[model samples]
Target: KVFGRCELAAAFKRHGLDNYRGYSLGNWVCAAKFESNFNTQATNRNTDGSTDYGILQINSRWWCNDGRTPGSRNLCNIPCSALLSSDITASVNCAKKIVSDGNGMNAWVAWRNRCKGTDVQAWIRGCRL
Candidate 1:
């Protein structure tokens, strides 16, 4: 499923992503915009034989066990395919783990390059979350 902007905002907000680890919902929303554009099944294969998966683009190299990514660590302890589910709970959980590791939002290069140092509150304007 491809989520609309505000729709994804509300979803992330409900999942405790709002103010999670000092990052706001808009930060999450912004990362999704650049990472996957809210598409649940989005994917990108990296040159290092790893892949990024799902809305927030959790990686196969270290986070998920894709069984195909060489040197995978599977820190998230689930199949990378789980990240592609429309339910989003797995994706959100993995994303939180990524931040909790001290990487914070910087885990995503997209967030670092774009969402960082930007005002993201308006990204969730009408969502009222």
Candidate 2:
């Protein structure tokens, strides 16, 4: 993977928001690998054409109306497809927002607990860089 140790470390640091608390860096790495194959530009569409985009597989089309353009008020000033246009830091921050906001990482500790255990081995292996 072109995303090496230093880059990944920086991304993790940014994603952690300097408040790791009980967060597991290993589990986060597993999630990233599983979701996007470490490819920031990788995207997928369901059979019904619903979309998942970027390194964290953010479903831009579904979540925000700016689905087509990154020029929205958020990350970039280009098309949503231009994920690589932003640096890894931006992607990591975006991912942190998605997980924390949508999954409520702080409110529901149970979900974060589920990321542990041998059951997640499949996801880890599949997404390992």
Highest TM-score, which number?
1
Kindly provide the TM-score of model 1 when superposed on the true structure, using C-alpha atoms.
0.97
What's the CA error at residue 2 for candidate 2, in Å? 3.4
Candidate 2: tens digits of C-alpha lDDT, residues 55-79: 5565554343335434334433334
Q: Which candidate wins on lDDT?
A: 1
Model 1 lDDT tens row, 2-107: 9999889989988999999999888999999999988999999999989999999999999999889878999989999999999999999999899999878999
Write down the RMSD of candidate 2 (Cα, Å).
6.4
Off by over 4 Å in 1: none
Q: Rate the local accuracy (lDDT) of all candidates.
A: 0.92, 0.51
Report clashes for each candidate as comma-separated counts. Answer: 0, 1
